[PDB]
Amino acid sequence: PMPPSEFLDKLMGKVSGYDARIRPNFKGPPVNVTCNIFINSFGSIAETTMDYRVNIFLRQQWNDPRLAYSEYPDDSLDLDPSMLDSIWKPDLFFANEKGANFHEVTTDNKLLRISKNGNVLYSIRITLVLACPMDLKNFPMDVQTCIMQLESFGYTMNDLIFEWDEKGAVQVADGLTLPQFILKEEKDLRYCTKHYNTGKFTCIEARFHLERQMGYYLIQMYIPSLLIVILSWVSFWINMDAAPARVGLGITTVLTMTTQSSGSRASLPKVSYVKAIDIWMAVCLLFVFSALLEYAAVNFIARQHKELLRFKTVEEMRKLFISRAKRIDTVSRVAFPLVFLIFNIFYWITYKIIRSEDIHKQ
Amino acid sequence: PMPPSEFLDKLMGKVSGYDARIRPNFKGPPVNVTCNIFINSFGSIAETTMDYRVNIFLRQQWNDPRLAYSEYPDDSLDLDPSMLDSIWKPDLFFANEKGANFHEVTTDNKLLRISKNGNVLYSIRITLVLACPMDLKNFPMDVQTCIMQLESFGYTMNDLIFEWDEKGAVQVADGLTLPQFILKEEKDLRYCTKHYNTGKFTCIEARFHLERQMGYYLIQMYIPSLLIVILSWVSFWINMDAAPARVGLGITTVLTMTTQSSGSRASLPKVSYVKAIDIWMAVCLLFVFSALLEYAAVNFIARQHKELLRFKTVEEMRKLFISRAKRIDTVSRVAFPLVFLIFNIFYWITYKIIRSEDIHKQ
Amino acid sequence: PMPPSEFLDKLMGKVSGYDARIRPNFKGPPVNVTCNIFINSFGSIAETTMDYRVNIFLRQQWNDPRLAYSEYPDDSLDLDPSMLDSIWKPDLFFANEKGANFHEVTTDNKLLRISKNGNVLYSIRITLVLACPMDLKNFPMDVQTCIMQLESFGYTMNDLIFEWDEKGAVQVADGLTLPQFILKEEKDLRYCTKHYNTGKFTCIEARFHLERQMGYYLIQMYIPSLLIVILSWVSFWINMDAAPARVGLGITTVLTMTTQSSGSRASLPKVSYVKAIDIWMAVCLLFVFSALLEYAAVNFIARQHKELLRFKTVEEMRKLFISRAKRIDTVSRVAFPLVFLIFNIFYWITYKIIRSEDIHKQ
Amino acid sequence: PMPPSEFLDKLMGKVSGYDARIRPNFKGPPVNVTCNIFINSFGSIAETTMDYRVNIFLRQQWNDPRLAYSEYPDDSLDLDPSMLDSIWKPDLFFANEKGANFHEVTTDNKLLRISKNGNVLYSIRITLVLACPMDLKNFPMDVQTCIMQLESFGYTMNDLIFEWDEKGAVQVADGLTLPQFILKEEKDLRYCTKHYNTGKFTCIEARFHLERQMGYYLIQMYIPSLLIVILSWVSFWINMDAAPARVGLGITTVLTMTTQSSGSRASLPKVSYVKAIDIWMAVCLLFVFSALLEYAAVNFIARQHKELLRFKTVEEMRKLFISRAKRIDTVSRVAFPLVFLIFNIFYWITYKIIRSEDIHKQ
Amino acid sequence: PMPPSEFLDKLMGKVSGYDARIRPNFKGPPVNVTCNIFINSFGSIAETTMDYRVNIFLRQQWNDPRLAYSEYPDDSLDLDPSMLDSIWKPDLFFANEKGANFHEVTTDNKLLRISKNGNVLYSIRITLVLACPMDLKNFPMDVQTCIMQLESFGYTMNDLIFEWDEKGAVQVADGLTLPQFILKEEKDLRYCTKHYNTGKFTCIEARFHLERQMGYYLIQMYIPSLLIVILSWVSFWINMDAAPARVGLGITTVLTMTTQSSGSRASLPKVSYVKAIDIWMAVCLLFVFSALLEYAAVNFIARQHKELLRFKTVEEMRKLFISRAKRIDTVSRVAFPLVFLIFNIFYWITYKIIRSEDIHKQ
Numbered sequence A, B, C, D, E: 001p002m003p004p005s006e007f008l009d010k011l012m013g014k015v016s017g018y019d020a021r022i023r024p025n026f027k028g029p030p031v032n033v034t035c036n037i038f039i040n041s042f043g044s045i046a047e048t049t050m051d052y053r054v055n056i057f058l059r060q061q062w063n064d065p066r067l068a069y070s071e072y073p074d075d076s077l078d079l080d081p082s083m084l085d086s087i088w089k090p091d092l093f094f095a096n097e098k099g100a101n102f103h104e105v106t107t108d109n110k111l112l113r114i115s116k117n118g119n120v121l122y123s124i125r126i127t128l129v130l131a132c133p134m135d136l137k138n139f140p141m142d143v144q145t146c147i148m149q150l151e152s153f154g155y156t157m158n159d160l161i162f163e164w165d166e167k168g169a170v171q172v173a174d175g176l177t178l179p180q181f182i183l184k185e186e187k188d189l190r191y192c193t194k195h196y197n198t199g200k201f202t203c204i205e206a207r208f209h210l211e212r213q214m215g216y217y218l219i220q221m222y223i224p225s226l227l228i229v230i231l232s233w234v235s236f237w238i239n240m241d242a243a244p245a246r247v248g249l250g251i252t253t254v255l256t257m258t259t260q261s262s263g264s265r266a267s268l269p270k271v272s273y274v275k276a277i278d279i280w281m282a283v284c285l286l287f288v289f290s291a292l293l294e295y296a297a298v299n300f301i302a303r304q305h306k307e308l309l310r311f312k313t314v315e316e317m318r319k320l321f322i323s324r325a326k327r328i329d330t331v332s333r334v335a336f337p338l339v340f341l342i343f344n345i346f347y348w349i350t351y352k353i354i355r356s357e358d359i360h361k362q
Ligand SMILES: CC[C@H](C)[C@H]1O[C@]2(CC[C@@H]1C)C[C@@H]1C[C@@H](C/C=C(\C)[C@@H](O[C@H]3C[C@H](OC)[C@@H](O[C@H]4C[C@H](OC)[C@@H](O)[C@H](C)O4)[C@H](C)O3)[C@@H](C)/C=C\C=C3\CO[C@@H]4[C@H](O)C(C)=C[C@@H](C(=O)O1)[C@]34O)O2
Pocket: A215, A218, A219, A220, A223, A224, A226, A227, A230, B257, B258, B259, B261, B262, B265, B272, B273, B274, B277, B278, B279, B281, B282, B283, B285, B286, B289
């Protein structure tokens, strides 16, 4: 029978001794805050500035003794979010972030629900440009581990304690997909406490293990390099007397291998360690460069042939240099793709075992 | 005869018991909100970040019993938008969005119209960077279905219910055109209710079917690839003894096919499935590569010819290798464009039937 | 003798019955608002997102009967812009716009001048990213017509009427120049009234006719294409037996024509109609491709010559094929630039007459 | 002995008749405002959108008679910047600007100092994206004159007059350097008064003469073009019978000259007048194109030689065509670099005299 | 026993004489402020606009006598950051900065702690786009010294004095790494006082010495240039009669050296001094150009050979020109890589000694 306006100005009134600046149960045990997040959107992962953009529904549960009411019989009592000025919302800030803008569209995207015993549910929708450092030791295949850290500002560990939720940890939205990565099902909850000269502060973090998909990099980078190496193999069947043809074919394959290697590393930060694509493009470039060196040795042997022919064992030395120049081409035509196939299976199995070692060590 | 200032401070006065924080007909049936949007601008569709930018006139109709007035005889009573602080606007937020900024130019772009019985018309102009996931299984021709979701924050299904309008669904502005797409005439209205641990929330959505126009991709991508394949066909008429000419022509056609294929995929996200342009550029690249292989086989047969000529059935084996080397060119000159025409009609009709299957299944 | 503070708190005081929420002459004829704009900056015209950025001094003149004063003898009475909270500024918003931010530097850039009879002058400085659709049927030469629409939000046609000024329409700043376009001297004032389900709203618009300057596109695009076609003509004088030279020259001219055509269309939206540069680059590419086909026919005739010479009317058939192979080069050397000159004068006069037809139809 | 709180609420109190909306010495002579700016940062000069970014310390000095105090004996009395709401700051706005955001970091970056007789010192730190039109008649060497205009909004010339400072004009920070330009020591102070239909408004402007440094453009653009022309000269020493070598060398030099000319104009607005780099790249491209034409004439004369040799004064006509084909190469080998050196010294001295004429006319 | 609300409204109440506009110990000695910063994130260093982005925890310690309390026995008394409106926070602003936005996510990221004797701890989290000028005299290896200046606005040196902290200077976060640079362990604290016409202002600055990592630039830039020079060395073994082969190989190596040099300078400001990569690419380009000149001299000597052979000491002059043309190739094949190795060791040791001289002079 009681009207709701006096009831919802009674608990936050200045005739009441609420004092929203003062934390609950002052001069006592620390407040325990339970947090669960809901990943609404995850994406826009950029490697060159090492950050990613999430959309989260940050839900914070804490108990306030002064907020308890015994008049109304309903337990939930969902409230309007405009009177969220004097409730004592806890301070929370993300340790590694940029941006972090609120959503003010059509209303402030906020949820306030005060239970009968004093439990408060506080939900806010925020997009954060979270910055995570990434390791690029293996660029085509890799398991990145993005770190999201939630800690407090201005309340030490003896006054405010952040804890993860027990029923579930992180709720991902159904149907959420990433175009370039695959989000793993398990998520780590390791809370570490940062120490500062001012004091220690409560901090909880969650880790997402991101598997990079290998379907795009196989089409864009691995197959055109094989096309270039196969073309340099095609140069072996051409006639050895046709010098501009073989020289031009080999030179253009080396040039396009260099430009392809320079263009695949363009969308990447300037890291200072050797990656896997470096190894792949280096061995492919070495293969086309060795093909050009093989033709240069063949044409040098033919040069020695032509100088000793035109100005005495001349016939059998002509035979020896033509037979040797034919033997080099005949053994190269078999030896080049076989050693390339050997390198391919060795590289692929060692990266398969180091990828499985990364997924086993985690 | 009554002056308007007391009348428009009477209904929102604190001497009145309006209490704009409290929802209408509290502790009763849920409020029913009818929404229709007006697409003022639609465009700026970007594939690489999978989002689009709309300009909408969001109109929300709901009934308030406390707002009803019986003094004035006029039914419409358009009001000034500055006193839209205490009216109980309903909470609405878009589920998949970025940005969503209001228009504050020369006034707040808002409309408030309170009917005599209590019906409230609330119109706001907002630009939203709506994020939609897109399928790129067929890149040149495709029918994208952009999804716009409108749901509530902080009021469950038992307190707030969102419904679409019956007289029309979505009003598009007259003369509105898209440079890259064609907006279909019908629009789906399927409302789905999202479930969360806190509770269930009302949500309505509208789907726009976007037909990608095929006029640009025919000019930019399909015809230059045919030019490259026709040039590789031109290489068959050149003399077989002119080895640097045919080798250089074929090698430059393969190189430019590779760079054209790499440059057409630049304005696209790094997806991990095979698209239609992948198939097209792959078959065209296979055609120019097979032309280079055909010349390599011709010059290998001529090599065998020259070695058996210069160091016995020599005349008729010279005839056999010249006749075979002529026969390969003569059959290739007919066989290459005919099998290309067969591939063209097969690819085009299978993509026509899969495009019509996509438009029939919807 | 009267001090100014009471006089300027008398007309906007709450002891006065001003009521700035209520429109002037309520329950009567509609308010008539006269608007003239002053183009301070115009520029930053981008084709790929189809919008332009203006800086305008929006001046709005309307009459308020309650604001009239008879105490002071001065007629102008320029006022301070801080008390522009309660004046009843009219609602105005641009129909096709993005951005539209106010200038808050060192003060709010505003002007308020209330005349003695009640005329109010309201000037504000705003930069608007106005979005206009453009037609690219003729890309090098074209007359774009940018549309600026000013309409009201929340006041129908019976309550608020917008009208253009009679003394002048749009004042452009002296010395204002555009690097890529030429602003015409006349400007259209056609007011159209938009109709919505809620009601009809007053709207006035102004059109600027923008002539695209042809000096840059002649240097960047038209002359290098002529350089490529002239180089392909140079290929006719080279010796026909030198096959790698003529083949390589023609192939590189075709390749660079393709890359030049692909690079000139890069700063353009993905439109689906044929433009004028498409026609120009297509005919130039057809010319260099026909030159390569002409050399392929010459070397095929020489192939027939060489096969019938080396394995009977042999001398006179050698004469016939050498004379025909010389005649093809001799007639091509004259016939190629003459038909190119014919195409040039036909293309140029038809685009001159369609440009003058566009400027005559307007 | 008087406490400072009553003294600094006495002069701005509502029990005082200060009335900060009303300008000082109302209904009298115009207020005289003295302005000096301090260039803290100058840079980020972009040619393609024709604007530059400054950081200025805007100091405004004006006299207020009502602010005068005779109680305290100190003359300076530096005040706290939070009570800068009611002081009657003058209206000032920059005529050609974008952005112009204030600095709110750790405090509002403001200075308020009220002298004993009524002199007020008002300093604010602002970064402005000032838009200046630039002339690109000579692109490598040029003296740009950036214009910064400071005028008033809403106060005419009879009420507010802006004047420059007498002790100095513009203070540049010590150690301030520009990477691409050189700031001259003198600065023009020409005040021009803008006229509008509403009235005339006071305006003062300052001009900075910016000398473009020529060290970068000599390395990036002038020397690689000389490398290309020297390579085309190297083509003269190669054997005339080696036709693919000379043809390929000349064709690749023409192609790379075209791409170098197209790439140096990329970071520039689409202007419609001929610049100096246009002239330079055009003459260099003409030189490499004439070298290709010279080889085409040599090989045409050799063609006439070969046709009259193989199907009568045959020996002496063979002599005449070989001697003429040698004479063309021998005279070209001397004549090409000498005429290039003549063009170089003529171009360089005419641009030196037109640069000195620009610096003498100013 | 005293409740906290009256105690925390007593010290900031208007019944108290706090007067937060007035600085502490007015008309006396200057306030001494001790500042220490905590580098939370450091990165996003861009060379082309010469600025870097930090995340700092700015801690300011100063003593206020009026804030001292003797009632409560606790010494720390951490307070809520909402009542940081009237505390007299000191004015601080960074001298060389852009941006500098506060963090408003979930609360204002602020810390307020008032000691018992009057010591105030004020911590704020800010991201600043700090602009630092950089010297690019040596581009691959360099030690940049970023300067962060903190000074006051509106309080002179006699009223406000800024001092660095004695216990530590700048705290870097543990685990913080930079992908492109290495942050040195020592940091300079040199405070310089800026002088202005208005007065002198306190300023303290901190310098970070940044070592550029050399691992990326060795892979991206130094090794492909060696690949190009090694390929030009490979051109010496090819047959001298094969003129299109050697000419084409040398010409494409010169062309790709030019494009590689133009592409490595793309991500750099337009500086006007010679860098180290300029010297490296210039010597490598000189090496490949000299190889092309060596082949041109060889083919000129062979031209003289062919003209004196075909139209008398003819045999021994044929011997002299073939022996000399062989001797040039034989001495070049040894002389080119040896002088390249000499240049490599000289360049590397002189840059090692100038890098160590830069790290010794600091
Ligand atoms: C085979 C290599 C040699 C070099 C051949 O290369 C060329 C011609 C002939 C050579 C012998 C080169 C190559 C294509 C082939 C033709 C082969 C087919 C048409 C396709 O390929 C197959 C193989 C591919 O598994 C390696 C396989 O993918 C799976 C992987 C995943 O399941 C594990 C899954 O995601 C999904 C099921 O799909 C799939 C069956 O498709 C063709 C689609 C390959 C892509 C072509 C690419 C298009 O743009 C690329 C690039 O811009 C380059 C410049 C041109 C193309 C090219 O490089 O062309 C290109 O790389 O011709």
